[PDB]
Specification:
CATH topology of the largest domain in chain A: Quinone Oxidoreductase, Chain A, domain 1
Assembly: dimeric
CATH superfamily of the largest domain in chain A: Medium-chain alcohol dehydrogenases, catalytic domain
Chains A, B: Alcohol dehydrogenase alpha chain
PDB class: oxidoreductase
Keywords: oxidoreductase
Oligomer: homodimer
Entry title: Crystal Structure of Human Alcohol Dehydrogenase Alpha-Alpha Isoform Complexed with N-Cyclopentyl-N-Cyclobutylformamide Determined to 2.5 Angstrom Resolution
Bound molecules: nicotinamide-adenine-dinucleotide, cyclobutyl(cyclopentyl)formamide, zinc ion
Strand content of chain A: 15-25%
């Protein structure tokens, strides 16, 4: 069998920054108390993974990235009770310990057990389960899904519908939920409102989805890559504009187009200039601007407090404000009920081994979501 | 009588920055179409008035400041229908034209007819009604109340209960409403929550009032002036702390005493450092921080967007989010029904001529609100 013993398998290891992933053989130690070992089936490529590669988002190296996945439970550790061998699961990039001041808070989701605030690169108990040639490998967001097998904490995995198309539902682990929820939960987009979405990757496009589902009258998609416009309009964008086409700042362009500014703006890129423009594009007296994109480490904005004093609301969120373990299975249950489709987001599918090609596709601007099959 | 003719009276004119006000004779032109001439009875001294004097809040000079007042209608111009001569009224520092996108949005109050965004120092028709020594004098926030008589736009004045104690209710024209609403309307403080209020002037203390009325469990008042602590506790503060007493930054001090941070932060001072500390002291995963204080002109904050990405909401508002013309009379109606007291906020009462003393009182930290009687 496999249960109880160290598994030898392949995973995409990142030894140095700005380097290609190296699929090597890694040793995956068995699950400990309240931990779960999962056999990865599908994993999507998110901009956040690329941020680590570029050194934009700091995390301890060497490390095994990936966090937008789905697989089957191989073994359960001592005391696990929510999932069992053979169950279909989605590992949670943000856990739900249930005992947190935040977890007990019906309005928030950023559990204290997260490894995002002060990245250690381990499991919640302070240790690693990965080894590549006698050297320990760090975990990423507590789930490290760019591996054929991974051990995560029990509160960091949710059991989903067994009839789930894992190659599709994996996007619910980050991309879709983050995008959709930012519009629905965080911003609370009102019917008949006007929205602005900067960034048309998988997360940004899911935000347009959330805006349409919320009944937005107008949904202006913004991106320097025009090839994304078709997918944008398909998913709900009333209009698409490219900043490169105008002589004046995009915020002014947008304000001119919407009688002073949009009701809800979203930044789904991860840049300071677009974050500012996004805040500046919502109406100064009633606009709400949500930060979705992850900005480069240790880079600060230069903001005027007056921009808020007039009546603006500026907020941010992780995973669309969704409590992970509790909502993820619910989102999957809504997918199975044809509430929303994930197909338009998936443009490419390659085998796990072609991971580096998947990142090349992202940089090319040709893909939205590329799913890696194990 | 006076109706239809130019009135000669005294007003506090500010010819130059950083100088004492100068009581002089001023010619007040009669009200034009949809304008109202008010005889001032009482006017409070707000920190915003002081900001103009300090050059911290830019506005055209020379100018007649004052905006927290109450008076009686002397005359109405052509077409006025909301108020008649003899009516007790509170002039609105921010108007409610009722015809703009913002006035039409029941969620906002920053009417486009405001003179705050791009201060012109005139009435809505782009002109002045003030002349002092053959030189025109600018208006302030369209109301200029540091004058025995003033002409304002019709949408910038509200008829209030004729049985109102004008020496008390003037505070509803800015100070109280702004502080109280910031807590109740803007922040939307929840029963059983923990709040932090930076700044204990009239506005700050009214915020504590709003937090208590909202059912907050803990209300931590913060100020470098300990003499304000008694009033703070009297109005609802569960505890008062002075930053000067700790070795570590106040935001860390507050987090340590609130399990990671308060649910709602309020900055009611007008400084970049305190606005940053305030944002930093609310919990990163569920905290809301409201900017109430007016920051110094042309000064920007250096902030990391990650502070919001984890789950924080950062907002601002003017006049506590209250639609002026509509809510002012109702707030007075509530005062008359003993819903709230304004007495604790009023610490000094001087005749209009002692205006400079009133500002000296603000600087000394001995006063909260000083009311000037005409
Ligand atoms: N808060 C969260 O929970 C959360 C979750 C997932 C992702 N993210 C962050 O969201 C951001 C992007 O998500 P993604 O996975 O869809 O990435 P992506 O790379 O596929 O999308 C980037 C999009 O932005 C566009 N873009 C880049 N520069 C632009 C510019 N200057 N102006 C306009 N458009 C520009 C690109 O053309 C592309 O359409 C990253 O910061 C990612 O880390 C945050
Ligand atoms: N947004 C609005 O609609 C609105 C309305 C009215 C006033 N305001 C602004 O709100 C702010 C306060 O108004 P106010 O009339 O109550 O002023 P105030 O002068 O009476 O209050 C300032 C308070 O802050 C305290 N303070 C100063 N420096 C401090 C520090 N470093 N740390 C802690 N406390 C400090 C002072 O001791 C005093 O208690 C001003 O910026 C005013 O312009 C805004
Ligand atoms: O890319 C995915 N995530 C990023 C990591 C840093 C900010 C959000 C998610 C949210 C769950 C982890
Ligand atoms: O001082 C009073 N106000 C200031 C002007 C600029 C910001 C708020 C009020 C709110 C109504 C006018
Ligand atoms: Zn992601
Ligand atoms: Zn938790
Ligand atoms: Zn004021
Ligand atoms: Zn208006």
């Amino acid at each position: 069998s496999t249960a109880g013993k160290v598994i030898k398998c392949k995973a995409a290891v990142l030894w140095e920054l700005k380097k290609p992933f190296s699929i090597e053989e890694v040793e995956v130690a068995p699950p400990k108390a309240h931990e779960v070992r999962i056999k990865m089936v599908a994993v999507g490529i998110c901009g956040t993974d690329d941020h680590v590669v570029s050194g934009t988002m700091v995390t301890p190296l060497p490390v095994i990235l990936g966090h937008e996945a789905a697989g089957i439970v191989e073994s359960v550790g001592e005391g696990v009770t929510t999932v069992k061998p053979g169950d279909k699961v989605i590992p949670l990039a943000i856990p739900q310990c249930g005992k947190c001041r935040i977890c007990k808070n019906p309005e928030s989701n950023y559990c204290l057990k997260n490894d995002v605030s002060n990245p250690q690169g381990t499991l919640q108990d302070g240790t690693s389960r990965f080894t590549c040639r006698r050297k320990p490998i760090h975990h990423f967001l507590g789930i490290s899904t760019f591996s054929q097998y991974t051990v995560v904490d029990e509160n960091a995995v949710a059991k989903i519908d067994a009839a789930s198309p894992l190659e599709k539902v994996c996007l619910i682990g980050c991309g879709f939920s983050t995008g959709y929820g930012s519009a629905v939960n965080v911003a609370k987009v009102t019917p008949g409102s006007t929205c602005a979405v900067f960034g048309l990757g998988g997360v940004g496009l899911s935000a347009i989805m959330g805006c349409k589902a919320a009944g937005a009258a107008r949904i202006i998609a913004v991106d320097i890559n025009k090839d994304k416009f078709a997918k944008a309009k398909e998913l709900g964008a009333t209009e698409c504009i490219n900043p490169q086409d105008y002589k004046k700042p995009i915020q002014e362009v947008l304000k001119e187009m919407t009688d002073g500014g949009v009701d809800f703006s979203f930044e789904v890129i991860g840049r300071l200039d677009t974050m500012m423009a996004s805040l500046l594009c919502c109406h100064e007296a009633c606009g709400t601007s949500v930060i979705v994109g992850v900005p480069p480490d240790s880079q600060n904005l230069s903001m005027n407090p007056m921009l808020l004093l007039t009546g603006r609301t500026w907020k941010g969120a992780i995973l669309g404000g969704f409590k992970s373990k509790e909502c993820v299975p619910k989102l999957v249950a809504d997918f199975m009920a044809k509430k929303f489709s994930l197909d338009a987001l998936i443009t490419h599918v390659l085998p796990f081994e072609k991971i580096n090609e998947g990142f090349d596709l992202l940089h090319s601007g040709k893909s939205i979501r590329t799913i890696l099959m194990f």
